[PDB]
Every structure is written in structure tokens, then in C-alpha cells.
Amino acid sequence: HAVCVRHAFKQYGSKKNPNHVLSDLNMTVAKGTIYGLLGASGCGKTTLLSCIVGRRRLNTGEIWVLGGKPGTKGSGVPGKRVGYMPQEIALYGEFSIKETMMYFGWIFGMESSEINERLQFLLNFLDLPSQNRLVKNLSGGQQRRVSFAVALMHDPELLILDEPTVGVDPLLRQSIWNHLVQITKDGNKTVIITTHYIEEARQAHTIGLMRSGKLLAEESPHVLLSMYGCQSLEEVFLKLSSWGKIKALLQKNFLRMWRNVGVMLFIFALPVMQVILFCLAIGRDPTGLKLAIVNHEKNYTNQSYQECSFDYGCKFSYLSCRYLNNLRNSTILKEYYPDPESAVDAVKQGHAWGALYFTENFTDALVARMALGKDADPETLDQSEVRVWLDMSNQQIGIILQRDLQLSYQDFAKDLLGACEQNPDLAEIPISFKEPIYGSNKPSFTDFVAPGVILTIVFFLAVALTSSALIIERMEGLLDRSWVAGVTPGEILFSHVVTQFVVMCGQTALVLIFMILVFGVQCKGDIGWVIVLTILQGLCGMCFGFVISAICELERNAIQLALGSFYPTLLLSGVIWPIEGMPTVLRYVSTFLPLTLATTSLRAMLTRGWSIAEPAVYYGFLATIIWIVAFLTISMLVLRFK
Amino acid sequence: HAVCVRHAFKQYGSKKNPNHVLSDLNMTVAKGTIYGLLGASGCGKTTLLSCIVGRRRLNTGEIWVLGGKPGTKGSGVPGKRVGYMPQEIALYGEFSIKETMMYFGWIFGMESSEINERLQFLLNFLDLPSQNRLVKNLSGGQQRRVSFAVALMHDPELLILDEPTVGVDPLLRQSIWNHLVQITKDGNKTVIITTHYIEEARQAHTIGLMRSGKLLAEESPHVLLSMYGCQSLEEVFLKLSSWGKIKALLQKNFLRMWRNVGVMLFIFALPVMQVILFCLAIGRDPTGLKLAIVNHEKNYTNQSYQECSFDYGCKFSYLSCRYLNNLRNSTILKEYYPDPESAVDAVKQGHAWGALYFTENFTDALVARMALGKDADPETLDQSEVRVWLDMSNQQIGIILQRDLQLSYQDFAKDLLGACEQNPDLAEIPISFKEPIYGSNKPSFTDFVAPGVILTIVFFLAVALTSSALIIERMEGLLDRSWVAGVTPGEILFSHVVTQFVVMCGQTALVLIFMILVFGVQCKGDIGWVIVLTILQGLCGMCFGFVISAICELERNAIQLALGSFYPTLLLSGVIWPIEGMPTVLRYVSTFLPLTLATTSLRAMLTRGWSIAEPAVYYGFLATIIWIVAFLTISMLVLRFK
Numbered sequence A, B: 001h002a003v004c005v006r007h008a009f010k011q012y013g014s015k016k017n018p019n020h021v022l023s024d025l026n027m028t029v030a031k032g033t034i035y036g037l038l039g040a041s042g043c044g045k046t047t048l049l050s051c052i053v054g055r056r057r058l059n060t061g062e063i064w065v066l067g068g069k070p071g072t073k074g075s076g077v078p079g080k081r082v083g084y085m086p087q088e089i090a091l092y093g094e095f096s097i098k099e100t101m102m103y104f105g106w107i108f109g110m111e112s113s114e115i116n117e118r119l120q121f122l123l124n125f126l127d128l129p130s131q132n133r134l135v136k137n138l139s140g141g142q143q144r145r146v147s148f149a150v151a152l153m154h155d156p157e158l159l160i161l162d163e164p165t166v167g168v169d170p171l172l173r174q175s176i177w178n179h180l181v182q183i184t185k186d187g188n189k190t191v192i193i194t195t196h197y198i199e200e201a202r203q204a205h206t207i208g209l210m211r212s213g214k215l216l217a218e219e220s221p222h223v224l225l226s227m228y229g230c231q232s233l234e235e236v237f238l239k240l241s242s243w244g245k246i247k248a249l250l251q252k253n254f255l256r257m258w259r260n261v262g263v264m265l266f267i268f269a270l271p272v273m274q275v276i277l278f279c280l281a282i283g284r285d286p287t288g289l290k291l292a293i294v295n296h297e298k299n300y301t302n303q304s305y306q307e308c309s310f311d312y313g314c315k316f317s318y319l320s321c322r323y324l325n326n327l328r329n330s331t332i333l334k335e336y337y338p339d340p341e342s343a344v345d346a347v348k349q350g351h352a353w354g355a356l357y358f359t360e361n362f363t364d365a366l367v368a369r370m371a372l373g374k375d376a377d378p379e380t381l382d383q384s385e386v387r388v389w390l391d392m393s394n395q396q397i398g399i400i401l402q403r404d405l406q407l408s409y410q411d412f413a414k415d416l417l418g419a420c421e422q423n424p425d426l427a428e429i430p431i432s433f434k435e436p437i438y439g440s441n442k443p444s445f446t447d448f449v450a451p452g453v454i455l456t457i458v459f460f461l462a463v464a465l466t467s468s469a470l471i472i473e474r475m476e477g478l479l480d481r482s483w484v485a486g487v488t489p490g491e492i493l494f495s496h497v498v499t500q501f502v503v504m505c506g507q508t509a510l511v512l513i514f515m516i517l518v519f520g521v522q523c524k525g526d527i528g529w530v531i532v533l534t535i536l537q538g539l540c541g542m543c544f545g546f547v548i549s550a551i552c553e554l555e556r557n558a559i560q561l562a563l564g565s566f567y568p569t570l571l572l573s574g575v576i577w578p579i580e581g582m583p584t585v586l587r588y589v590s591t592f593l594p595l596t597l598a599t600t601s602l603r604a605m606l607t608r609g610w611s612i613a614e615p616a617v618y619y620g621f622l623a624t625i626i627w628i629v630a631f632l633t634i635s636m637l638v639l640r641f642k
């Protein structure tokens, strides 16, 4: 007996809306015959076929297919001994017909010599175009013909065809039925055809009519016609009551990316462009700021000329052009106005960032202030000071202008004394800053954000790749077709991890080369542990794509959940601002987030050179390991009940 | 004479590898009969039906349906004079059956009173569940029946049914065919039914067999059988040789998103949550910074207690506990260590950010330095100074620590004199900063990024909503089904712009309220023009969704195209860092980007209170207007050659 289903029962949904898809179903399929299964809808037959192949399980009843229970190692129901043609075209695009044949033959263990003979025979028999034509370039009928040829290549002892000829040319239909008759006759082969056609399954040696989840009758066609006395079948029906699989899967995964230029540009040319733009735009010091200078010790000539001239040695000739000489040249441009009212007006518009206004007696009052110290009259204290009106609406620019205007006075003051043979240490505030313990006196903001950009690119470009791949592959029956072919779920998962591991290693090479070698972001720590931490974040990101793909069933719902969690964690992990800004209550919560302790750990490796032994460094390695385990437990728990 | 087709030549390709989908094709449909079209594949017949309806145009020949050419004057072919049932289920999910019938009835202009009678009749006739059940909750065999009911409800004079009986129970197929032969009984009605199943189109009055893009024979079924002598048709086919339509579309647009809890949360609850997290974590000043104080003038008791006391009046008792009282209590936490080389070990680890180290001779050396002047010996200048070893690996924390330590010395110095009846102005550097022209002396970074975050949320929440809505509709056949109902593309586009405009107004109100009324972000300028500019950036975002949806056809390629331009534009529009830091060549390129000049214009209206008359303000209005027109032009050119 090819198949024996006895007292099959099946339920769907919850108790609120029970669905008795199968109820007390009996079925028998002998060896060497064709068994047509004609049903009204398209659900009971598909559910029965899924129970036969082993995908589903019966609530009550018994099944004996090919010798033993489906998928129990007592028989080879999922494997080379069965031939499956799904209702949908569960084929791979971007695959030539020859490549599809090779992939499935390797999955079935066929040698490459016989695959070519079978391919040539099937191409000659099924009226198909050249083997090199990609499947995505074919029409619906040719795609269905290729899907039918896939189920015939390994010569199984049980064929399960789901509407094999729905719109096939009538001559081709006749040839197909003749071939099925030839292979099934006087042999061990069996065919089980499921169709909505009532009038095509006349050549089936036994017909089973489905209704209300049970077989109304099951007899030979002409026997049914004679016994019920009807001219055609419709009148009778019109009654009022293991390394070869992994190698095959590895060459499929990499070839599914090479034929998508959009995918390669998104996961290999976007990080390179993102890193280039970040290192050129973020963190650098502003370097074009303009200042309106009103020097009343010199005559006004132009808005771009002042003839600031003085004597370098001594005698303190001007001291207003001498201060402006020490001003830093890279970030401040000098503009000249003849009136403090005319210079403040420029600031009130977008023509300057500040005003200076040296008074006409700046020199005399400044010398009389240093010489007569600790008892200077209020008149001197008012005529010897520079009056700066600043535009402090921008925080970072206001910081630079205040820093560069007070720092230039220190150099100016260290030049006045020292040119008259005095020590320059007399012009220093008692608060003296010694050599920094870490870093330097001129830090950069792009060194603070660089650790956060590296981890965010790797983490969230693996959530996108895994969720998209495992969802579009599951929705078109590609996973269910290869499961019947004999590919265990462990082998499906192993190949995805290896493929994703290699991809994330290429991204790590590109991101770290451009950040460090080209744009000169310092790495004072161990380069070996930076590579390990970046990769561990990629695996943690990949494990989050398992959660998303186990919850969401549509692409549009997965991207909302991926983007709905990428934004909040970016603003709480301290990538673009120090973690010390948040309140104490909000600082506790942010620590437990996936990327918070990993960004802190990477920032200490690069900016301070700390090793793995430091508590602040290995806390970012233990935090990723916990989240890898947590993301796997949640994903496994979701699949348990759903 | 309903449909006449003469010499209908239609071809697909680019004149290099042409596909002849149609050839010399003559076809006449007599009024008052049932016509079956029984081709093999599913593309030639579908192409012919699309030409008949009016969707497409031919290359040669004439098409004459119901009086005149389709889609032109002289006929009502696209409208209420035809009834179209597509090959795919083109129904709306999240719609009850009653709501679907009301929607399609309003499209055809029938009164809501007589829609009920048709609904009840069709419900009873087609054996369907209660009208309150959602379409998505129906099975696959009931959605086809609902589609058939939709195609039959307004009582047209020409029914074009595309395989209405795929998985229908025979007891219902008989009733459907009886209804079909009953309505078209010596009347004005015609049915054009196209099937792959030859045996079921026997009841049709006329049959046209299609092959290779032409009709092999077109005669009565019994005449076809008799003239060739065959018993069934299978052997014979073996031939080796406006208001009301806009109102209806607005209800459907506002009900599609109200019935999707995921969509409501993404576009209404995520912008609110994003604004809260940004205003609580980004831009604020660090607060818990710890310092390691070494004070050799006092005894050492604990790591948290030092018993610092002095005399407030005069005589300068300790002057090292006096300076520490002026330290800012908010940002600096004081810790005490016994040795100068022991507190540096705390900084080397993560237990502090700096060290202070007041010497044991600090009080006597400081009072002997300020009381001497310019003649202090080098020994005194070394014993009267505080030595700070800072951790400058963090740029932002390094600024606060240096600013607070230098500022506290000014308040300390301004307190020494003033308590001894001296002029406090004596303790000032000549560089004196007057009152800022714009802003205050303590600017906030979150005020710099807030104007850039408002525009980014609104712009990219419209690219997401517009691209997804217009891609799901087109790929599911819903756009084409309503076009045959008479809904002009002008009314589809007008009702979409209205739907998005109302949504972007609600988003603007939520973002502006949670930013200004709560969290107190300053708004100096006019609030009337802040709302206008924010909405104008929303319309530019929607127009970018037209370009994406007209270029991409799959869901996943629009996601990558949208994200592939979101990230590069964020790093070039000066949202998170001043645009003055970028190199000059990159600065010129960035000003032409969609969001650059708009962010600058909104920042000036918020932080300085500038009006529309300032060039820096209305340049952001001009750039948004120009990019709106450019985006609309690009979408039209793409739709021309595609």
C-alpha cells in the first residue's frame, strides 16, 4: 500500500472558531496505480497532502505511507523516495534551469553525470527553452513546467502532483498523461494527483471525491459511472447527499546575493559611503567664522584692509595690532568696520559672528594698567578692555570663539613679558593643567562618535538581512519544498549563520579600514579585541532577526518593527551624546539595552588603550553574550506556541 | 453587437526580441448571449480582456465595445455600463462585506437605500456568511464569491468574468450558471466568461477557442461538436493543424489605517516617543562627574569627608577649602585621597575624571603671590598653583571640567577682594564679553538639534507612508479594478494628497506641542511660519514617495531606495553638527540637498526670531518649493518611458 489513512481527524483554530477540516477520513492508495483526488475547495486536499508528506500532524487517526509513519525514520517519506510538486511555484528566481536542476540533484545525492542526462531528457520532453534562461525571465506556464520537471528528476517511487496541468497546451497535456501512464504501469511507482478539474482525471485508476472533510466515494472511474448511471463524472459528483546538502545550500545562499545588484549595493556600498561621509562632516572644527573688527587706533581703509603694523621688539607701540597678530588664522576671518554701531549691525544680520571694538586709547590704558597693578583707577580699567559682543545662538561655534579669543590673549601676554626679559610664568592663572592622563589637550568629537557608528552599522545591517531573507523565503514555500526534499531544519539554520558570518566579516574589514587607516581615527588598544567585539555585535544583531521573522509574516510588518526599535535605542545607548546627560532613573534603564555597554567598551579600547582585564571593557563582552542567549530563547519560545 | 475586434495586432518587446502576444484577431460578441473564451495560457486572453475594458491600447486594428472605442467618448465602457471581475482577488482587506458593497455602490452613484436590497439578494443567493465578517477573515473560496457579488451588484449590461468558478462547490456552480443564463434571456445583457477549464463552458451560447494569439474557431458548442463529429470539446480543441467618488475614496483611505493598529502606532506614536527620548537624553550637560581632591592642608578622615572650614571675613585662613566652596555643586562630585600619586591612580582607572592636589604651602604662597605682583620669585609661583591632571579622552566632558574649574577661580578671586573693600573689576582679563546679541551665555546643544529633528521626522514619515500605500494598491490589482469603475486617476491622486495632508498636520501638532509646550524648547520667532515650513517639508516628502513608487515595483526595493537616501542626507544637512565644519567643496554640494536650507531657515526662526524678510529665512521656503516641482517632474518622466 502506497498510503493508508485510517480514521483521520484534524482541527484548526481555537475553540471559539473550530474548523473540522478532516473528520473520520479513510483513504487507501495501492502500488502501481494513479489515484486522482477531486475536491470542491482547495484546502482539504492540500491539508491531506501536507499530512501525508509529514509537514503537519493528525489530531486523531493513523497514517502509513511507503511503509511507516510520516517523518519517523521508519520510512523515507521526506527524502529521495518522494516527489513533491507544490500548488504554488516554489522555485528560486535568479536561477537558470540548469542551476535549479543541479541544486536539487545535489540535495537528493545524485551525481553530476546523471543530472545532465535527466536535464536533457526533461528539456526535450517538456518543451522548454534553453537551460541558461533564468527562471525569473520565464512566463507562468514555463515556470510551472520547470516546477514539474523538478519533481521528476530523481525518479521517486511516489509522486505527489498538485494540479500538474492547469493551463498546459493540450498536446503537452496528452504527452504528460501518456508519460505518467508509462511510468506507473506494471511497476512500483505511484502517482497522487490533486486537481479542481473534474474531467481530466478519467485516466486515474482510482478516483476519490472529497466533500465536508471526507470521501463521498472511492472507486474506478467507469465503475462509478456505471454504478451511479451517469453520462459524465460531474453528474456523479453532482449528488445532493550531510555535507552534500550544506555545500548545495552554501552555493545557493551566496548566489542569491550575487545576482541582486541592489542587495550588494545596500550591504557593501552603503557602509563604505556612510563611513566616508561621517568622517568628513561630523566632529570637525568650524573653520570659516568671520568677525567684525573696529580698531580705532588705525585709519579705516576698506572692509578687507587695515594695515595692522607695529614694532615687534618693545616700547608697546600699538598693542591692538599686536593682539590681532596672535589670533588663530584657520578659523577666524577678519573684517573691518568704522563704527561699533556698524559692526553690531553686521552681527544682527548674517555677516559676522561677533564684534571687537578696540578703543582709540587702548595702548596707553593697557600699559598704565600692567605698570600700575592692584590699584588701577576705574578709568583705566574701562579704557583698557576689549569689548566682545558674540552671537551665542550656536553652542559649538560660541564655544570656539570664546576659547580662541581668550587663548590668544595668553599668547599675547606671554609675548609682552619675555620681550622685556621677564619670565612668562607670571601670566598664568593658579589653576594649572598638567599633561593629560588620557587623550590630549585638543580632543575631537568624531573620535567620540566613531565607536558608536561602527557598532550601529554592523548590528542593524544584520537585522535587515536576516529578517528579509527568512521571511521572503518562508512565504513562497521555498522552505517547505526543501524540507520534503530531506533538508533538516538544523542544516537550514547552519548555512544561514555561515553565510551571514562571512558577510559581516567583509563589512568589518571595510568599516575598520576606512575609519582607521584612511581617515586616521586612533586605535590605542588591541586591534584583535576590536575585531572580536564588532563581530559579536553582528551575531547579536542576527539573532534579533530570528525574533522578528518568527513574529512577523509580512515584509511591511518586519520593517516597522525593525525601524521601531532602531530609533529608540540610538538615542539611549550614548552614541551621539555622553551617557552622563540623562537623569539617574533613565541612566539605569539604558545600561541594559543591547548596545550601551558595548559602545562604552569599544570607546575605552580606542581612546584609552585599555585591555580585556579592565571591568569597563569586559562588561561589553558579557552584555552581548547575554543578549545573544536572550534573543535565542525568545525566538524559540515564540515558535513553541505559534 | 456588443464587442467587435478586427485585426487586433499587439506586440511586447523593444524591437529586438519581440513577443507576438496578439496576431490577426477577429472576434464578434452578439448581444444577449453567453460567450466563452477558452485559451490555453492565461496571458493572451487577459491581454484581450484588458484591451476590451480599456486599460491598454493596440498597435493595429479596431476595437469597438458597446458603441465606441474604449476609454474615449461615445461609450461608457469604463464606468457603470460594464462589470469586471479580475483574475486575482482585488478586494480590500480590513473591510466588512457590507462596507465593500457600500463603497463600490457609491463609486457607481447608486443610492444607499437600494444597495441594501442588492446586498441581501446576493448574500442569500451566493451562500455567504453574515455581512459583518471582515474580508480577511473569510476563507479563500469565499473571497472569490464576494468578488463575484461585487461584479454583479450594480446590474451592468456587459459582464466580463475572469474564471468565476475555480474552487466552487458544484451545487453552487449549477446555480451560478442558471443565473447567468437567466439574466441574459432575450435581453440586453451579455457575458464574456474566460476559463482554462474547457468542460465547464458548454452552457455558453458561443465559444471561441484561442491559440497562438488568434481564434481557431468561433461557433456554437453543439455546431462545433457536430461539424467535427467529436464527442466532447476536449477532442475538438485537439487541433494539431465627481463628489461621491471622492467622498467614497476618502472613507476608504481613513478606514484602511484606522483598522491597522501597527500603522497607527508607527506614524502617530513613534514620532511622539522619539521626541520625548531626544529631549531627555541628547543635548543636556553632564552632571555626575567625580573629582579626586588631594588637600594637604587638612587631615584625612574618609574618602567622602574632609571637614573643610575657614573664616568668611578676611585674614585668609586656608584658601584651599575656600576655593572648593565656589566649585559648582551640580556637575562635580568631590572625593578625597591621601596622596598626590594615589589620586592619579583613581584617574587611570574609571574612579575619577581628574585630580586637584592643593599643596601644604598653598595658603601662604597664594597670599604672597597676589600681594607681590610682577616680582614673585619662581619658587612662589610653583607653590601657589593648583595642579590638575584631567582625563581628556571625552571631548564634551573635558569642556565642562575645564570650564567649571576656571570659572570657579573667578568667583573665588572676585570674593577675596570685595570682602577686603577692593574693586572686583581688578580680577578680570581685558577680553570682556558683553551681553550676547543673540542667545544667552549658557547655550544648549539640544536647541541646536531640535530644529533639525522636527523636519527629519516629518519628511521621512511621509516617504514611508506614500511609497507603501501606492505600491500595495498597484501590485494587488486594486488600482486597476477601480479604474474600470470610473474613478479617474485625477480623483485617486487628489484624494491621496488630502489624506496625507491631514495626517502630516496631526503629526506636526503632536511634535510641536511635545517640543515647545513640554520640555520648553525656546521659540523666539513667529509660530505661524514655523507651522507653514514644517508642513511644506511634509509635502516635499510625499512627492519623493511618488518618485520611489513610480520607479520600484516590489516592496523590498522601495525600502532600500528610501533608506539608501535617508542616511546620506542626514549626514550632509547639518542636523547633528554645524555645517561650518564640512570642507568647502562638500559644503557647496550640501546646500542643494532637500533638507539643508530648510533646517537652516527653521533654526534662525527658533533661536534668533528672524522674520520672513531675512534672506536666510525665505531661502528655506524657496528650496522646498523648487524640490517639490523637481520631484513632480521626475515622477512624470519616469512614468512616460516605463
Ligand SMILES: CCCCCCCCCCCCCCCCCC(=O)N[C@@H](CO)[C@H](O)/C=C/CCCCCCCCCCCCCNc1ccc([N+](=O)[O-])c2nonc12
Residues within 6 Å of the ligand: A274, A453, A456, A457, A458, A460, A461, A463, A464, A556, A557, A559, A560, A562, A563, A566, A567, A570, A576, B263, B266, B267, B278, B449, B452, B453, B456, B457, B460, B461, B463, B464, B465, B468, B469, B559, B562, B563, B566, B567, B570, B575, B576
Ligand atoms: C532597518 C534597520 C536598520 C537599517 C540599516 C541601518 C544602517 C546603519 C545605521 C546607520 C547609523 C549611522 C549614523 C547615525 C547618526 C544619525 C543621527 C540620528 O540618529 N538623528 C536622529 C535624531 O537625532 C534622527 O534625526 C531622528 C530620526 C527618525 C526619523 C523617522 C524616519 C522614519 C522612516 C525612515 C525612512 C522610511 C523607511 C521606509 C519604511 C516604510 N515602512 C512602512 C511600510 C508599510 C506601511 N504600510 O503597511 O502602509 C507603512 N506605513 O507607515 N510606514 C510603513
Ligand SMILES: CC/C=C\C/C=C/C/C=C/C/C=C\C/C=C\CCCCOC[C@H](COP(=O)(O)OCCN)OC(=O)CCCCCCCCCCCCCCCCC
Residues within 6 Å of the ligand: A547, A551, A552, A553, A554, A557, A560, A561, A564, A565, A566, A569, A594, A634, B261, B262, B263, B265, B266, B269, B270, B273
Ligand atoms: C533592540 C531590541 C529591544 C528590545 C529587545 C526585546 C523585547 C522582545 C521583543 C519584543 C517586541 C514586542 C512586542 C511585539 C508584539 C506583538 C506583534 C505581533 C502580534 C500582532 O501584531 C501584528 C503585527 C505582526 O502580525 P502579522 O503576522 O504580520 O499580521 C498577520 C499577517 N497575515 O505586528 C506589528 O506589526 C507591530 C507593529 C510595531 C509598530 C512599531 C512602532 C511602535 C511605537 C511604540 C509602541 C507603543 C505601544 C502602545 C501599546 C498600545 C496597545 C494597543
Ligand SMILES: CC/C=C\C/C=C/C/C=C/C/C=C\C/C=C\CCCCOC[C@H](COP(=O)(O)OCCN)OC(=O)CCCCCCCCCCCCCCCCC
Residues within 6 Å of the ligand: A261, A262, A263, A265, A266, A269, A270, A273, B551, B552, B553, B554, B557, B558, B560, B561, B564, B565, B569, B594
Ligand atoms: C533625498 C533626495 C536624494 C537625492 C535627490 C535625487 C534625484 C534623483 C533620485 C534619484 C534616485 C533614483 C533612481 C536610481 C536608479 C536606478 C534604480 C532603479 C532602476 C533599476 O533598479 C532595479 C530596482 C527596481 O526594480 P524592482 O521594482 O525592485 O524589481 C521589479 C522586478 N520586475 O531598483 C532597486 O533595486 C533599488 C535598490 C537601491 C539600492 C540602494 C543603494 C544605496 C547606495 C548606493 C551607492 C552608490 C551607487 C553607485 C551605482 C553603481 C551602479 C552599478
